[PDB]
Task: structure prediction
Amino acid sequence: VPLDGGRFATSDLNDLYRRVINRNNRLKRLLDLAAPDIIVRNEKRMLQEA
Amino acid sequence: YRYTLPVKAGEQRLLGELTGAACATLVAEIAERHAGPVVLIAPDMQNALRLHDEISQFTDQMVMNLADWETLPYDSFSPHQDIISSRLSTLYQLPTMQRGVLIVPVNTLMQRVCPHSFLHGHALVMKKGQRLSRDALRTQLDSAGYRHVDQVMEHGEYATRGALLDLFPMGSELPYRLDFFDDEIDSLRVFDVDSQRTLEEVEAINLLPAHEFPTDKAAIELFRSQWRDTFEVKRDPEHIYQQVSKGTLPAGIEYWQPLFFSEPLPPLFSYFPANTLLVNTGDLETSAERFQADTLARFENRGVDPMRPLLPPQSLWLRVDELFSELKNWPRVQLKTEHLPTKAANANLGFQKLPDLAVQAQQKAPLDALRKFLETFDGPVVFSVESEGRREALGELLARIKIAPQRIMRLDEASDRGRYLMIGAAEHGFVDTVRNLALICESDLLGERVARRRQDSRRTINPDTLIRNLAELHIGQPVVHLEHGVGRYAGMTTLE
Amino acid sequence: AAFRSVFPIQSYSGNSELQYVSYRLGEPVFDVQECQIRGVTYSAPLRVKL
Amino acid sequence: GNRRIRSVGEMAENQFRVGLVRVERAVKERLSLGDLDTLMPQDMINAKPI
Amino acid sequence: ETLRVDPTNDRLSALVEIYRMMRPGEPPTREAAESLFENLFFSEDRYDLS
Amino acid sequence: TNLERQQILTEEQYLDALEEFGDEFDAKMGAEAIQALLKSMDLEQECEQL
Amino acid sequence: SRARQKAAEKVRDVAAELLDIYAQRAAKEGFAFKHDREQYQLFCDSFPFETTPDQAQAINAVLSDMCQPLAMDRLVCGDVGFGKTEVAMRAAFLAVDNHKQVAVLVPTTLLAQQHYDNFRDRFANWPVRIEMISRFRSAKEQTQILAEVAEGKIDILIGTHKLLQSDVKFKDLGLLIVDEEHRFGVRHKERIKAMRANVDILTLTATPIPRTLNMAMSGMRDLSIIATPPARRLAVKTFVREYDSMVVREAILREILRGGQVYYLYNDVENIQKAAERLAELVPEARIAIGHGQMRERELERVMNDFHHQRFNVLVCTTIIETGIDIPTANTIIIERADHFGLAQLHQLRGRVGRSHHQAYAWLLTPHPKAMTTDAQKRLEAIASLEDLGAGFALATHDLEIRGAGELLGEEQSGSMETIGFSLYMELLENAVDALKAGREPSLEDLTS
Ligand SMILES: Nc1ncnc2c1ncn2[C@@H]1O[C@H](COP(=O)(O)OP(=O)(O)OP(=O)(O)O)[C@@H](O)[C@H]1O
Ligand SMILES: [Mg+2]
Result:
C-alpha cells in the first residue's frame, strides 16, 4: 500500500520473503558454480536463518 | 698450513683478521683437513642460513643445517612435523658421521633433545625376509606414533588394506609399500605420491617416529603422571592435560616434551661423534645470554593462564653456564674479525678488506676503479656471482675493460696472474694477503649509499620582492606565500 | 563541554591535529511566526572556528 | 536524592555529543590519510551526523 | 569464606582470572591482563564517574 | 567403523575421522543431515524397541 | 582546477575500437610456430625442478596452441606461487627459437626488474638477448634499447607500461606475455594487440579481474588452471586481528628468530617514514627499511636489492609488492590496515609469503570491528574463509559476480554495468568479421597513422 506521499509501506512479510528468495537464488548460483564447501556452508546457514 | 688444529679436551684456537665472507672459506678449509665432523655454531639463525649458502660454494663436503622448531619459545604452533622429520633424521645420523659440516645456531644448540634411547628404540630397519606379522607391524607403528590414514601423502602416516601396507617413513623422503604374504614382507617398493605406482624396490629401508616424544598409551600415562607431579589439573576440555588424555595433541605440545620421558633431556652435546671440532662465528657469550634472557622474559610473560601452564626453561633449554661448561668438552676454532695480538692458540690470517671498487655512470669511464685495480694486482683475482645469468651480467661488464673471466669450480684452481669467475652466494670480497689472492663479489661493485639529495637550491628567484626579511610590513599589505597563494598580512599573533 | 571533550582530534599517523577555538550561533533564517507558517524548523546555524 | 533531572539542555547536549563522536571518527580518518597540505577544516568535517 | 572459595592465591592469577572472565578464548599473557585491568576501571579515557 | 549412529563430530574431529577412516561413512551437516536422520528412521520398530 | 565537473561525455567510444580490434584479430591467421623436440628438451633440462602434472598440462596446452595457425589467446589462471612464470618462459623459448621477439608486460618496475633477472638466469646458455625498459633505465639507454628493438636485435623486451607508448616499435613481434593482467585495464591490454593484429597473447594471472574471467569461462579466451601445489608449499595461515602492538611484535620476533624476513605493508607514503620509525622502536631487534614507488629510482632499486641479500629483515612497503615479487625467504606479511583492500589485492598480498618449504603466516590487522564498513567485513570474512592451496580460482569466481563481470564490449572490467549478452556479442563479431573479409576494410589503427 502507498503512504499517500509517493512512498510505499514496508509490509514486513515481503521483506522476509525477498530476503529468503535472495539467499536461495544466491545459493543456487553457488551450487551451479561449484563453490568451495565453506562458502556454500555459510550461505546454507544464512538461508536457514532467513 | 697457516695454523694448526686443536685436538684435545677443550683447547681453543682463535683466528683473527677474518673479514666478511672469509669465515666461509676458512670453515671450508678446516672441514677438508680434519678427519671428523665440524659443528659450526653460528651466532644467529639468519647467519646460519648465510653460512649454509656460502660454505657449500667453496667446498664439496656435506654442509647441512639442523632443522629447528620454526616456532618461538612457548609458542602456540606446531613445528609442522615435516620439519620434525628433518630434525629426527639428522639426530639419527649425528652419532655416526665421519665428514661434513653441520650448522647449528645458538638457539638450537641451547635446546635439549630427546634421549636417543627414543631414537634407537623407536626407529627400525626393515629388510626383505622379515617374519613380522601384518598386525604386529601395524601395532609397532601405532606405538611408534604414526597416524592411521587411507591416503598417506605426508610425513608420519600409514595405510592398511589387508595384505597391502603402505607407510611413509620419516627416514626417507618417499613412501613405501610392503605387500604382505604369509605374515612376511614380500616387496619393499617405493611408490609415488602423484602416480601411486611402484618405481623400484629397496632391499633395506629405515623408518623414524612421528614426533619427538612417545605417543602410545604407556607414554600418555607417563605424561599424566609427570603432569600431576609437576603442574595441577583443571577440569576443562581445552586444558592440555585433559586434551592429551583424550588422545589428540594441542598446538604447541612440543614444549611439554620433558613430561613424556621420565629422564632429563640430553643437551645435544651427547649426540656429537667422538671427534668433532666446533667452529665459532661472532661470539656466543652475547647471543646465548640474549636468548636466555628472551626465553625467561617470555616464560614470565606467558607462565600465566593456568590452563596450559609452562615448564621451567631449565627443563627445556641449557642454562648459559651449562652451555659454556659443556663447550669445554670439545676443541674449538673461533673465527673472529679483529686483530688477535700474539700467543699460542692464536693466529692471524691476512684478510684485508677490498679496496674502493664501485661502478657509476656519472663519469666518462665508469670502470675506472676496476680498470686500475686489476692492473696493479700481482696475484690472481676471482669474481664471485650468485646466479648463472648474473655471470653474463658481469661477463659483458668486464668486456669494457677487455677482460674475460675463465670459470673455476674450486678457489684452489686460481693460478698466478688470473682473472676468474665462480658461482655461489658469497656476499663480500677480501684480499688474502697471505697468498695474494682477491675475491670480488657482486656487492663490491656497488659501494656505499650515493645519498646526495638533501636539498635543492631554492635561493633562486629571490629579488627585491623578498626584501631580505626586514619584517617592517604594515597591516593589510598583500603577501604571497608560494605554497598557498596571495593573502593579506594581518599582524603578529601568539598561538598554542 | 562537548567541543572540549572531543577536540583536539589528533591523527594516528602522527602529523596533524584539528583543535577547537570557539563557536557562534548565527542568526536564524526565519523567526517563529513564519517558521510556523511555512512549516520549517526555527533553528540557528552553528558556526565553529576549527 | 537518588533520582536526577535531565532537562532540555542536558539531553540535547548528550545527543549532540553522540552525533559528534561519528564526526570525530571521520575527521581522524581524513587526518590519518596522507597529503594534508591541501586540506581545510571543511573537506573532512560533515554536518550530516550532527 | 570467599577466600576459601577463591581459586587464586596471588595477584597475577587474579588478573588472569579477570581476563578470562572478560574475553573467553584469546589465551592470556601478562600484559594482556594487567593493561586490561588498569584500563578497565583506572583509566581516565575509558572510565568516568561524572 | 568406530563411529556410532548419531554421534556429533567437531570440525577438527571430522577432519580427523576423514583422514583416519576416510571410507564410505556418511557424516554430513545441516538440515540435509537432519533430514537424512529422520528419513532413515522406522517408527514402528523403534516404538516396539522402546 | 574544476575537478567537480564531469568533463565531457565519453571523449571516445570504446565499443567500436574494441569490436574492430577483436574482428581484425579473428579475421586473419596468426603465425604457425615450428616446434623443435630435442632443442627444447635442453631448455627443459635447464629447469632445476620437476613440472607438477597440472603445470605440465598448462605448458603442453600453451605449446600446442602456439604450434597452430590460429592466433593464441589464453589465460593461465593458477594460484600464487605455483610456477606460472615457467609456463611463460617455455612459451617465450618456443617463440624466440623462431626469431619472434617476445614482449613481456608487467604492471610495475619491481616485477620488471625481477622478471629481467629471472629471464636472464634462465636464458643464460643460449644466444638470446634479454633487455628491460622502464623508468629505472636512464633516458639515454632507453633510446638505445628502442633502437636495438626496432633494429631487431633484442629478442625479449621486459617492460612496464612503457611498452605501450607508441614509440616502442617491434621489428617482428611474435609473442606477447601480459603478466599480472588484473592491474592494467582494457585499453592497456589491446594497445599492443591493435598494432600487431595476429600476435599470440599469453596472459598470466592468479586472480583475474571479473571481465577477463567471465570472458575466459564463456569460451572467448582459452583457460588453463594451475591449482596443483608445488614441492612443499604450505597453506598460508591467515589471522584477522584488531591492531595490537604486542601482536605485531610477536609476529616480527617469530620471523626474525626463524631467520626469515617480514613484509610490513603500510600503503601510505606520506606517513611511511613515521610508521617505520615507530616500528623500529616497537621492535629494536629488527633492521627496517622503507620501499615504495614514489622515492627516487636509484634508492628504491638499491633497497630492494639489499632486501634480497638479507641486509635487513622488515621492509615497510606500499602495495608495490602486491604484484608478484618472489623473495623466497620472506614468510610473514603484516598488513597494517587491511579493511580497505580488495579481495584480489588481499589474496595477492597473502601470496607473497610461502614460496618455499617453510610455513608462512599472514596477519591482516584491522581497526575495531564496529568502525569497519560492511563491505570490509564481507571481504575479510571471505579472505579468512579460504586458506587452502589453489584457493585463488574460487576466490576469483567469488569476486566475479560479487562485483559482476563488466561491459564485455566496453571498458569497466568490474561491475554490473548492464552489459550486452554473449549471444549478441558473438553475432556482432561474426557480422564485423564477415563485413571485413569481403571489402578488406583497412585496420582502424593504421588509419590513425
Ligand atoms: N614444478 C615445480 N616444482 C618445484 N618448484 C617450482 C616448480 N615450478 C616452479 N617452482 C618454483 O616456484 C616459484 C614460483 O615463482 P614464479 O614467479 O615462477 O611463479 P608465480 O610466483 O606463481 O608467478 P607470479 O610471480 O607471476 O605470481 C619459482 O621460484 C620456482 O622456482
Ligand atoms: Mg608471473
In short: Residues G 84-85, 179, 204, 324 surround magnesium ion (ligand 2) (CB under 6 Å). Chains E and F do not touch (no CB pair under 8 Å). Chain E has three helices and no strands. The first helix of chain E runs from residue 2 to 5.
